[PDB]
């Protein structure tokens, strides 16, 4: 819908209208910092950062969240892996396989199912090292994840250890579930049924259940 | 097992070790507002406001409160009614006889059922006045429904305003139900008991038997 411009690159941001008013701090917290996170490669590619600014969140429910984009191939859409190659989005489609019994598919897109946005707490990382990038995300993720938290009705984060003390200093209401991240020890992702328990929660709040079988692709 | 004193009326607090950790803090936030409290006649009597703290937590998964005690005839154990009087207890024991299917029943009670802690929020009330020691009892609440949060596997409130507010500050998972007097038969078609066993069975715990509570 709507764009703002910001001092170094991507330097033009489009946004859906429903993220207004948060860009305004977001433009001065960006430039604050991209100078120092534009110095390294990245996952992803600075114009493909905020791409996921254009989705609304109105009509959202959940977010899913993961700590920070895959170390390479980072589309801008957390958690997407265009060619199904990555482990996490592997061994998620599975979880959803084993619970929904959809047993023949080719990928699995968070993007594309009804009331879900798929959400990186951190927009980069230098290309190769996951988490490298916290200290300049840092206020900014902040501001993002609290303003997602004042319309999803449950927060679902993916990593027992990444989301420890993050999770705790977002001051929001918002019901949270912290999982397991899907390539834990000892097959911990494999027994977490925190994709059910979210549609008890979201049932509990009078709200309707997240059908995840909308996220395979044929 | 152990004991505690404090400055004012019941003067003894005995409790089960695995309150051990905020005791020294009770005793503290107690002996700063017990005047208040004890001004006026209280349900439950004041030997009484805490023998809830002889329950162990560690074998407790679910955690079902109320927002203070009757308004009269209080026994300190949070539901407890021993004549089978009180409207809430009643309208609890018919809701899980329709899900259990036992049918013949001259009483219920939480406290005798294994996995289950029944807590009042406040815990006591000027006799006869709803919510009228909230302000006193505040710290302390907080200080207590946390410590049983880090136990239990979820925490059932029972009553939509009285437990609207986010001031509790834990993860625990949260269900805040109609109370058992609430207009429009809200609380017969409340299925809170039955969706606590579901989540139960989603943390890989047991589910809690609700038949256990009755008495005959
Ligand atoms: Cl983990
Ligand atoms: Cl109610």
């Not at 859906?16 to 590619?45: C, G, K």
């Not at 191939?73 to 199904?84: I, K, L, M, Q, R």
């Not at 609290?146 to 449950?154: C, D, F, G, L, N």
Request: aromatic share 12%; hydrophobic share 35%.
């Amino acid at each position: 819908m709507n764009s703002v411009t910001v001092s170094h690159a991507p330097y033009t941001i489009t946004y859906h209208n429903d993220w207004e008013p948060v860009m305004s701090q977001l433009v001065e917290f960006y430039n604050e910092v991209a100078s120092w996170l534009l110095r390294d490669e990245t996952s992803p590619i600075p114009d493909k950062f905020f791409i996921q600014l254009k989705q609304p969140l109105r009509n959202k429910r959940v977010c899913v969240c993961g700590i920070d984009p895959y170390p390479k191939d980072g589309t801008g859409v957390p958690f997407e892996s265009p060619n199904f190659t990555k482990k996490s989005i592997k061994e998620i489609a599975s979880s959803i396989s084993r619970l929904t019994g959809v047993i023949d598919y080719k990928g699995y897109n968070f993007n594309i199912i009804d009331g879900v946005i798929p959400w990186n707490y951190y927009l980069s990382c230098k290309l190769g090292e996951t988490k490298s990038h916290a200290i300049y995300w840092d206020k900014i993720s902040k501001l993002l994840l609290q303003h997602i938290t004042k319309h999803v009705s449950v927060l679902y984060c993916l990593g027992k250890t990444d989301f420890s003390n993050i999770r705790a200093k977002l001051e929001s209401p918002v019901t949270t579930i912290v999982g397991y991240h899907p390539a834990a020890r000892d097959r911990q992702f494999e027994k977490d049924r925190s994709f059910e328990i979210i549609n008890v929660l979201l049932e509990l709040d009078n709200k309707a259940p997240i059908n995840w079988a909308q996220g395979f692709i044929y």
